Amino acid sequence: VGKLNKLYGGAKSRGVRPYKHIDASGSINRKVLQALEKIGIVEISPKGGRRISENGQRDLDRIAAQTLEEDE
Amino acid sequence: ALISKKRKLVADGVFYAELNEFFTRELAEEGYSGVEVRVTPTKTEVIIRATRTQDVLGENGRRINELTLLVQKRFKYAPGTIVLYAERVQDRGLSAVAQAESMKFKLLNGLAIRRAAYGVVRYVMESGAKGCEVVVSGKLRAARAKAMKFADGFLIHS
Amino acid sequence: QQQQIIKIRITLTSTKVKQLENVSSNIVKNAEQHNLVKKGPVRLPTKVLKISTRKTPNGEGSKTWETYEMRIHKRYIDLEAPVQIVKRITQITIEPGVDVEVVVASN
Amino acid sequence: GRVRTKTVKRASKALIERYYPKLTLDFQTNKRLCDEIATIQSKRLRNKIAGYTTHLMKRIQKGPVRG
Amino acid sequence: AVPSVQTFGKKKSATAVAHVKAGKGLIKVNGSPITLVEPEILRFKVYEPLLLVGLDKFSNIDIRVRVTGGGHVSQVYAIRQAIAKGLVAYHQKYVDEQSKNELKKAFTSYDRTLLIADSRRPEPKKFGGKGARSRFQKSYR
Amino acid sequence: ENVWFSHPRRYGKGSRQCRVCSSHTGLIRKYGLNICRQCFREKANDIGFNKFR
RNA sequence: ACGGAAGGGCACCACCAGGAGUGGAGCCUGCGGCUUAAUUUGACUCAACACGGGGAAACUCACCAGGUCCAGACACAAUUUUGUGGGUGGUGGUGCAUGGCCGUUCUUAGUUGGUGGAGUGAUUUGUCUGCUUAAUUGCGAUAACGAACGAGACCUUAACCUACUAAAUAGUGGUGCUAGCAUUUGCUGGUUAUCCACUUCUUAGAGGGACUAUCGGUUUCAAGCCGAUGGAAGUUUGAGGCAAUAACAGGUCUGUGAUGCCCUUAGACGUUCUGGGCCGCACGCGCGCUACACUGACGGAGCCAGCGAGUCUAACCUUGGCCGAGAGGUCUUGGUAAUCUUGUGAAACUCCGUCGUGCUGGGGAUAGAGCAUUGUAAUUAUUGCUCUUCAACGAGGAAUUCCUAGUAAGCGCAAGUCAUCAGCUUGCGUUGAUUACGUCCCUGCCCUUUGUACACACC
């Protein structure tokens, strides 16, 4: 999330000054991350970081191929 | 504490810089040339060579009382590692800084315009320096400003 | 084992010649007086990580200046000596400033 | 810019007067022979006299020199 | 003790292992393709090493590499030219001789930094000077 | 005998003055030096001298 | 030296050729003025005005509030106690009672003797009639001969070695099984003296490349032009550094007690102290940008660059967790750190559903309410955050700056200045593209001739 809010940052003006890149919100990022943690898609992995749970792994491999073969 | 990884190992320049400027702006009458330090293993010995060995010996204590105690009271070495005994050493007068001390003495003793001149050129000849170039700013008379100069033997410029 | 050979890499690092000649003459005379294997050292392209505290704020005028440069003469020894004498080289000739990286690697 | 100087000639005339049967046409035989005929204390002088040996074999295959 | 060597091999700006996996034109390594990228900028630039040279031209060559080093921009701007050299030059054992001769003669008048592999290597610079194009940073007095 | 010659001096430009010559520059606290610009030139051998570039 | 005389040769701080602009709402900078006790001072041309760290919140703040305060050694009328010549009080002061350091002559090459002679001296030959440029660079003849310096005298450069019996932070086969599919072995921890060796990228020391050569003419080849261009280099090897010759009433006497200098210690030539102005504007000058679009927006990959500090007696201290609309607030984690805030991650780029060009979406140097940070200190808003009508220009005249491979130019980050206060400089990135290869027409700069009543030398 420390890089997610950065990558979602944007340009802001300090009046008669140039535009500076500034980080995005952290509150909503933490809240949606916790929401999906409670739902059980994302999961906190060892050594620092998040991994994908088995519902998301099943959504990744087979049904993605099925959905794209349907809509293509 | 007084320890850092790769900061003081490079910032140590200021110490011997202060040492060098102090030796230049105070240790001038002795003819301070350079510290021929030789740290032998199993016997840490820090010596000094002088072109006026009679003067750095002196009356046995007036210079030594400061010279042996100030180099130790500052950093608190154990005794017997920064030792001050001066001996007869060769090739003391074979350097540009030695010619600089010689012409300093020849300028300070107060000879006339030609006597110091042929004296210094005979001395640099007998030392074997085949060329010199010197400039003196300021003045001899009481006027605005002057810059005298003479160069014997042609040098690359610069 | 008894009389272990783990070969902690002794990292010869000096700044001045008075200490460089001191430690190099020390280790080679030690090898000479207790008859170590005849394998001597050579220098290196020194391990310079660029760090310094510059004090040149603003760029006006022309350059009548020097170069900020310094050589930490980090050298090494290509030999097969015991870890015992590798440790005793650090024990004797006490001068704070010589670093020894704990590295279990002989060659 | 693409002009020559007397600094190469003062060595060139001497080395050919010394070693007429030397100066084979090839660049490395010129260079690795001249560097040990004449001591050089500069890598840029080494590269420049390499180039000048190329100029020299060009002048030799041009033919007789005026002097 | 044992003469165990790691088969060190060279690449554009990184290391490699010298054990190639032969195949039947499978441009992948067993769990992931690379070529499906869809950048929306460099599409014709990546089609240039292949579309002008021959459409498939992979019936007798695969790329089997895993290296961590160099850079991503160097990777995108190097691997395509690398396999271009592999398919135009290393294929001299396989491709038609007159075809590759025609190709080299066609590219002699095309060497305009489009068929040049990135031979860049990282290099450190020394502390004391920073300028590249503008002037340095010095004070008066 | 004076009571009012003290004054708060702990931080800021009013507390710390130069030590070089009662100089008028050098607001640089690098390694506690606070040394002047003419003073950096009075310093002899701290530049790391060598000339090729 | 000059020439408003002639010839020859160069410069995108000169342009038939144009592009990016200032001068337009505007300020950060000093001037002169009103100035309050002060709004402290230096300098006036391509050679100051974003310069003197000068982007100043209580001694570099020099100005007052003034009851400031007696705090020197040495004859004195009976804490030298009012007064003495002056211990320093110069911290009142000039580049003009002194040097030193930088700049100008250095967008263009010129400099010096010793011999030989000529000038019955100043001086001249050497230092050049032509012929080519980044050059006194090569041919060539000569009162010429043989010698150093500016380039040549040196090294860092830019896409460099199957290379160095060099190091566990940058990694590769076999892999220690697979936790993503676990049968389609690359991998997830390299099972915390951790699957071993080492550099093949973190640390760079050597010798080595490219030279107009193999072609022909453009000089008689003795210079030099082309294209097959040959790549660690066809522009000398792109960009960088030697202040060479000898001078400047040039910035530094207020820079370190640096100069034959005017005066004092009780009313100190004010050392210090309660604080605050040092950003006040009727005015113009100068480098720096926020817009004058369907180019304003959601969603995402767009992230490929070394840059810099750390208690050692006071503030650098979390990558991650948690609360918040957000300044922000607390913990294994960082004082000897390639090691921890640092595993530095530099930014808007194409897209379609929709609103949507207008003085309205194009924005905020303008004014108001609340949320808190660094600093005793946020007063004459230091600063970021939630909201509120936008005045501001329809691309700004006369005049004036930069511009030919990492091509100017639009854009954002790293470092110095920083406790907090960038529009100030260097390096990178995204696109990496011109309108130019000739000129002396304006501007200046070097060589030759010529005249001069100038030589503190056309002010």
**Secondary-structure element pattern of chain D, one letter each:** HHH
Overall number of strands of chain A = 4
Whole-angstrom Rg of chain A: 18 Å
Instruction: List the total number of helices of chain D.
Output: 3
PDB class: ribosome
Keywords: K63 ubiquitin, oxidative stress, translation
Entry title: Cryo-EM Structure of K63 Ubiquitinated Yeast Translocating Ribosome under Oxidative Stress
Chain A: 40S ribosomal protein S19-A
What does this entry look like structurally?
Chain A: Belongs to the eukaryotic ribosomal protein eS19 family. This is part of a larger assembly, with chains A (72 residues), B (158 residues), C (107 residues), D (67 residues), E (141 residues) and F (53 residues). Chain A has helices at 4-7, 27-39, 54-70; strands spanning 10-13, 19-22, 42-44, 50-52. Chain A is 47% helix and 19% strand. Chain A has 72 residues and is α+β, with helices and mostly antiparallel strands. Chain A contains three helices and four strands; from the N terminus they run αββαββα. Chain D has 67 residues and is mainly α. Chain D is 66% helix and 0% strand. Chain D has helices spanning 6-18, 27-37, 43-62. The longest helix of chain D is centred in the C-terminal third of the chain and has 20 residues, at 43-62. Chain E has 141 residues and is mainly α. Chain E has a single domain (1-127), classed as Ribosomal Protein S5, domain 2 (2-Layer Sandwich). Chain E has helices at residues 43-51, 72-88, 97-108, and strands at residues 8-10, 15-17. Chain F has one domain (1-53): 30s Ribosomal Protein S14, Chain N, CATH 4.10.830. Chains B and F meet through helix 2 of B and loops of F. Chain E binds one RNA strand of 459 nucleotides through residues 2, 4-11, 13-19, 28-32, 39-41, 64-77, 108, 116, 118-137, 139-141.
Offer a concise description of the structure.
Chain C has 107 residues and is mainly α. In chain C, 24% of the residues lie in helices and 4% in strands.
